[PDB]
Amino acid sequence: KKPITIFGPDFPFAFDDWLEHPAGLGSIPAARHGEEVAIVGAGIAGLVAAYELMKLGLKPVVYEASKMGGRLRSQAFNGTDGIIAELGGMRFPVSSTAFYHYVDKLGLETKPFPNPLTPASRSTVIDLEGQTYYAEKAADLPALFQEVTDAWADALESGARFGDIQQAIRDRDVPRLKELWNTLVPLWDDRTFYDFVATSKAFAKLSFQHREVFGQVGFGTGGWDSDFPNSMLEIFRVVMTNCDDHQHLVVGGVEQVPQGIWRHVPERCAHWPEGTSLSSLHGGAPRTGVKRIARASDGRLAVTDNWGDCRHYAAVLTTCQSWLLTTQIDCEESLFSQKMWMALDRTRYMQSSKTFVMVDRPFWKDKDPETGRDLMSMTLTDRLTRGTYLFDNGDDKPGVICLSYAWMSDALKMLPHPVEKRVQLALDALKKIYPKTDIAGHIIGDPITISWEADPHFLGAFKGALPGHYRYNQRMYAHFMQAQMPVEQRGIFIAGDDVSWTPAWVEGAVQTSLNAVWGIMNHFGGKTHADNPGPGDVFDEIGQIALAD
Amino acid sequence: KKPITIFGPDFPFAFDDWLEHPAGLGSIPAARHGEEVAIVGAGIAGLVAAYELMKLGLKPVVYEASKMGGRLRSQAFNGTDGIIAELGGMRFPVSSTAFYHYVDKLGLETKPFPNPLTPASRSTVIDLEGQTYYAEKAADLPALFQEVTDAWADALESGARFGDIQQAIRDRDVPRLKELWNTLVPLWDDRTFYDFVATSKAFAKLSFQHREVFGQVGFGTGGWDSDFPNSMLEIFRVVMTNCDDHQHLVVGGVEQVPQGIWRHVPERCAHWPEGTSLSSLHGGAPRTGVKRIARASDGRLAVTDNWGDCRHYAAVLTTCQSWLLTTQIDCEESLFSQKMWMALDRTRYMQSSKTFVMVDRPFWKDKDPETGRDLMSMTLTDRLTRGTYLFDNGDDKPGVICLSYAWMSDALKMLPHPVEKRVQLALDALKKIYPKTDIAGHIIGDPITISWEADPHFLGAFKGALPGHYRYNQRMYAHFMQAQMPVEQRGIFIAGDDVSWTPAWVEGAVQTSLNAVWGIMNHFGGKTHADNPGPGDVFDEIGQIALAD
Ligand SMILES: Cc1cc2nc3c(=O)[nH]c(=O)nc-3n(C[C@H](O)[C@H](O)[C@H](O)COP(=O)(O)OP(=O)(O)OC[C@H]3O[C@@H](n4cnc5c(N)ncnc54)[C@H](O)[C@@H]3O)c2cc1C
Ligand SMILES: Cc1cc2nc3c(=O)[nH]c(=O)nc-3n(C[C@H](O)[C@H](O)[C@H](O)COP(=O)(O)OP(=O)(O)OC[C@H]3O[C@@H](n4cnc5c(N)ncnc54)[C@H](O)[C@@H]3O)c2cc1C
Ligand SMILES: NC(=[NH2+])NCCC[C@H](N)C(=O)O
Ligand SMILES: NC(=[NH2+])NCCC[C@H](N)C(=O)O
Ligand SMILES: NC(=[NH2+])NCCC[C@H](N)C(=O)O
Ligand SMILES: NC(=[NH2+])NCCC[C@H](N)C(=O)O
């Protein structure tokens, strides 16, 4: 059967094909080769855009105020080799084909993420209202869980034509996908996931306890209460495109993706010599942080860095989170329309906390001889840890445990504590669920924790779309199409997690980056190959619908 | 006409009559007089309860881990006498009769708060998408504003029977009020304010710009977008009891309320000698913070403070924010049911930021001769300041300006910055709105700002009720009614902002405090005077409805 991929629904453009096509992403007039283009941010969107723009014969100049890779971050444990903790993105649905084009281009290895109730996870434990349920396969779980999923499946079918939409994504039936999706947009934009569940027949006839459980752990593979405040359109996008299943981690860390792009020598270059990489073009590193972006008197854009070095560019791509433009960067008002500023100012963020420890061996695989249970499991609970993940690197090698993976309030509970106290609170809660298991006695190396908002170069882990925010996301997603814009707003671009329709998923950032690649190519008078048309070529036809005032 | 008051709708008990009635709140047996009851928190809920329990002849012992007065907090500017910035609650609707009982008992002066489009405010300025509208009265605004309000009024009438609910509150017609209120509870518990507006007929026929405006500034007297994610029941409670209009500030600072309660000598004391106050009973200060609460081997509760001093009490009232019980305080699991712990952990909190400066005079009253406009006004904007308040202390005296009053995301945008940066960013934004006013040249004293979550004894400014949370709040609001509880769960009580049905409004804190006074009096074997029945005497009849599973 034809695979689900992140194919629209909003802009069902075949990004994978475009990348894969042997003609390449187009060209720029030789008169403009070597000319510079500024990119704010060295995250995935920034680097992808830079790598392809280098390939088209430009010299991208990448600015990074903090850490390379952005929210793709793999930190090594003390004293080990290649045993990492994933601090940002960690599980990558195979439906993320544009993302995976670069994984494979770098020849990196992946393996299935140990999600609850998947072949990759041996067992799962669900812990609710002080009671514990053990499961080696879904069916082992009590009846209430199956009832929960049936209502979910039923609510999606009733309320979204889920099956029709999934089929249209599989066959890449564009007119059909847009027909289905377009009738949904004005009906769910301004309603939350909460309202979805509240007004669905299936959930209504179930108990309050059923709903409660659905929020905490879903039907036993992960909960939904962090997402409840979101526009129901966001949630649809996630489940429709199977973002939530068949996921992989990158072996040795997904940070290798942005680090590898940086150092990768493409087989073919416009203008540039053999062996040119983003790294060689920069002398090894991106520029420091951007502090100011202004319209210069000669028409160009002035980018001043933290150290006062001011440079002039025909174009600038920003990928830093939207609120930074309006607070931390001095970004001149004339550079965006009044309605673009309002879209950027209304982006909201979800909070995330994760805490990791390394262990001497995957002791959790050991069986308790009394009960036949694994000593520990992929753990879902209403206690403060929420989610606990188990990473086996072999019996031969040390294991990693993500003790706690929380969002929103639960992440806010962890925010003010030092690492030590987070690890201790987690271990306490895990003692309650597994009173006989001695996790602490297997722990080696240093603990590793992360709170994203706590970083000054981030506002949260990723955006979450509020109800009614379709129009703001729509203006942002279309910002790379500049034919109709006043001159004073052109030549600046945006891309990234904020611009994407599926914010907590790395593919949306890659996709938005590629749209920007086209917007920038176009801005330098370039165009796509006739047999490999690009985002801007088809966007007025199949692009995200616009809503009437 | 008979006044709107915070009278139900959930628990329409006339707290004002109870407190005013010459019989007093009841009695406790003489054998129990002088006996101690522990109170965790020296905010308004703790002090109120301590004050009345002391009058019934008990010896309350108040613990405060941080500052007295809690979220009622009034900080003096450098070098001035009685010129303060309100850091917690600042505007108190006259419907808050139980709160005002204590204000009047202490003889404090109030004056109308300078809300937009009130007699207290000369002018208001609305700033949206770079466009500025000036108004001396509501009608001076563009038509869109009046349309917004007509839709809002219509939606409340259609959706909630607002006019009948307000009439019944006025007449204090309990059966009627509960009839009308109880049909709403199951319908709107699990839907947001967003969905209410979305799905209202009146808003549906208006443009998106109408809704947008309604979030940002409402119909010109304050916006609603920080409240959009909340259970609609919460919003109904606020508009129905007129919490949002006819508000006063306390002259010289609302912090005089709790401080004054601390010092106040009641005219009549059971047990205690002439001249007894909370302060004399404590030798001048509350005890330090609380670290531990446990059940002691003699049946009483053991409270251990930060320094290890352990003391025993027949009952304990806690008013600290609910998550502190589950994290910062070591509260023994046996003291609460499993379902109570769950209600306590589900509390989520709203964020707030305020920044204030003092000025040499209320220069904003001056007129621009060209336009006839006040040089500045109460300002509502989509820029980062959001809300700006002007406080006139007389032509004779310095002014106070609340430069910025923001919630949620807008508040989080400010969180990480020092005061100097906040002030500057505010001043920059106000310059855009008033390019001709020189605010900075009037500023004297030190700038004052607050971020509540940043404090380690607070999680946010106040709770916000999520959809679906009615049952949790119901369990918590009724926790004071202990006749059905297991012995091991009795004698501890909760009260406060978190316990209340109207969480950003001081009355709910006072009201819940008074319910627990009743619970504690009941616990010591006391009772209310036959002609002045108290909360627990009628609670089973008119108390908050309980929802089936
Ligand atoms: C906790 C968490 C879990 C996640 N899990 C998953 C997952 O399981 N699966 C999945 O697919 N995706 C996941 N993601 C999403 C993925 O991590 C992001 O979508 C993606 O990495 C965003 O890339 P980007 O370039 O858009 O932004 P980023 O990677 O943030 O890049 C933007 C960069 O701009 C930089 N910057 C900021 N200010 C300035 C300045 N003044 N000057 C210069 N540079 C600046 C920042 O420092 C940052 O490096 C997760 C994200 C988080 C936070
Ligand atoms: C920014 C803001 C604006 C507001 N505006 C308004 C308004 O305009 N109108 C209005 O009516 N209401 C308003 N309020 C609400 C009002 O201020 C609160 O409802 C009320 O003051 C809360 O009172 P409380 O006694 O329940 O809690 P607090 O005043 O929070 O409680 C008392 C104390 O518990 C203490 N404590 C914590 N941990 C411990 C421990 N471990 N041991 C001992 N003690 C501990 C804390 O230090 C705190 O002092 C506002 C609140 C805020 C934050
Ligand atoms: N069994 C219990 N409910 N214990 C106390 C619960 C504390 C809270 N739910 C937490 O772990 O964050
Ligand atoms: N509202 C959200 N998108 N929440 C996070 C869910 C998706 C995210 N990529 C994860 O690994 O969990
Ligand atoms: N509402 C506006 N005029 N926005 C345009 C940019 C304003 C800027 N982001 C601010 O918060 O002050
Ligand atoms: N509708 C609300 N609860 N809004 C949030 C702030 C409320 C607060 N009591 C005030 O008047 O400032």
CA dihedral over B76, B80, B81, B85, signed as positive or negative: negative
User: Tokens 């316990």 appear where?
Assistant: B499
Alpha-carbon gap, residue A113 to A220, rounded angstroms: 16
Alpha-carbon gap, residue A184 to A544, rounded angstroms: 12
Give the gap in angstroms from C-alpha A194 to the nearest C-alpha of chain B.
6
CB B67 within 8 A of CB B73: yes
DSSP string, A17-45: HHHH-TT-S-B--GGGTT-EEEEE--SHH
Is residue A383 within 6 Å of ligand 3 at its C-beta?
Answer: yes
Alpha-carbon gap, residue B223 to B382, rounded angstroms: 10
What are residue B349's DSSP bridge partners?
Answer: B463
Residues of A whose CB is below 8 A from B212: 468
Taking Cα atoms as reference points, which of A68, A36, A30, A67 lies closest to residue A54? A36
Pick from B195, B196, B384, B408 the residue to mutate for testing the A interface (most A CBs within 10 Å).
Answer: B195
Which DSSP helix (H) or strand (E) runs through A170? helix A162-170
Ligand 3 centroid to Cα of residue A383, in Å, is: 6
Residues of A whose CB is below 8 A from B211: 190, 468
The closest-lying atom of ligand 6 relative to the alpha carbon of residue B505 is: 9
Alpha-carbon gap, residue A351 to A406, rounded angstroms: 8
The closest-lying atom of ligand 6 relative to the alpha carbon of residue B91 is: 11
Resolution, expressed in angstroms to one decimal? 2.3
Cβ-defined contact of B327 to A413 (cutoff 8 Å): yes
Angle at CA A471, nearest 5°, toward A470 and A473?
65
- What is the location of CATH 1.10.405.40 in chain A? 113-249
CB A417 within 8 A of CB B328: no
Q: How is domain B113-249 classified at the architecture level of CATH? A: Orthogonal Bundle (1.10)
CB B341 within 8 A of CB B333: yes
Alpha-carbon gap, residue A451 to A73, rounded angstroms: 13
Alpha-carbon gap, residue B476 to B500, rounded angstroms: 9
Taking Cα atoms as reference points, which of B65, B57, B61 lies closest to residue B32? B57
Question: CATH number for the B73-91+347-469 domain, one of 3.40.630.30, 3.30.43.10, 3.90.660.10, 3.60.21.10?
Answer: 3.90.660.10
Provide the 10 A C-beta neighbour count for residue A268: 8
Task: Consult the annotation and say whether A147 binds a ligand.
Answer: no
Q: Is A92 left (phi over 0), alpha (psi -120 to 50) or beta?
A: beta
Angle at CA B306, nearest 5°, toward B302 and B310?
25
Q: Which of B384, B416, B456 faces A456 most closely, judged by CB atoms?
A: B416
- What is the location of CATH 3.50.50.60 in chain B? 1-72+92-112+250-346+470-549
What does the block give as tokens for B70? Answer: 């809690």
The closest-lying atom of ligand 2 relative to the alpha carbon of residue B45 is: 25
Dihedral, CA of residue B93, residue B97, residue B102 and residue B106, to nearest 10? 70
A529-533 contacts at long range (C-beta below 8 A, 24 or more positions apart): A529/A21, A529/A23, A529/A24, A529/A26, A529/A27, A531/A21, A531/A23, A532/A18, A532/A21, A532/A23, A532/A24, A532/A25, A532/A26
Cβ-defined contact of B467 to A228 (cutoff 8 Å): yes
Write down the experimental method used for this entry: X-ray
Q: Which of A326, A467, A549 faces B198 most closely, judged by CB atoms?
A: A467
Alpha-carbon gap, residue A183 to A186, rounded angstroms: 7
| Alpha carbon B156 to its chain's center | 23
| Alpha carbon B403 to its chain's center | 21
What does the block give as tokens for B290? Answer: 């609380």
CB B517 within 8 A of CB B480: no
Provide the 10 A C-beta neighbour count for residue A333: 12
Q: Read off the amino acid at residue A202.
A: A
Provide the 10 A C-beta neighbour count for residue A446: 15
Which DSSP helix (H) or strand (E) runs through B403? strand B399-407
- A471: contact with B, CB 8 A cutoff: yes
Q: Give the residue on A whose Cα is nearest the Cα of B205.
A: A549
CB A48 within 8 A of CB A513: yes
Cβ-defined contact of A338 to B130 (cutoff 8 Å): yes
User: Tokens 């070597």 appear where?
Assistant: A34
Q: Is A352 left (phi over 0), alpha (psi -120 to 50) or beta?
A: beta
Burial class (CB in 10 A: 0-12, 13-18, 19+), A233: buried
Task: Consult the annotation and say whether A497 binds a ligand.
Answer: yes
Rounded to 5 degrees, φ, ψ at A133 are: -125, 135
Give the gap in angstroms from C-alpha A92 to the nearest C-alpha of chain B.
29
Peptide bond into A9 cis (omega under 30): yes
Ligand 2 centroid to Cα of residue A381, in Å, is: 30
- B307: contact with A, CB 8 A cutoff: no
What does the block give as tokens for A350? Answer: 């979800």
Cβ-defined contact of B208 to A412 (cutoff 8 Å): no
Alpha-carbon gap, residue A439 to B10, rounded angstroms: 47
Q: What's the fold here for domain B1-72+92-112+250-346+470-549? A: FAD/NAD(P)-binding domain (3.50.50)
Pick from A226, A466, A471, A475 the residue to mutate for testing the B interface (most B CBs within 10 Å).
Answer: A466
Provide the 10 A C-beta neighbour count for residue B266: 16
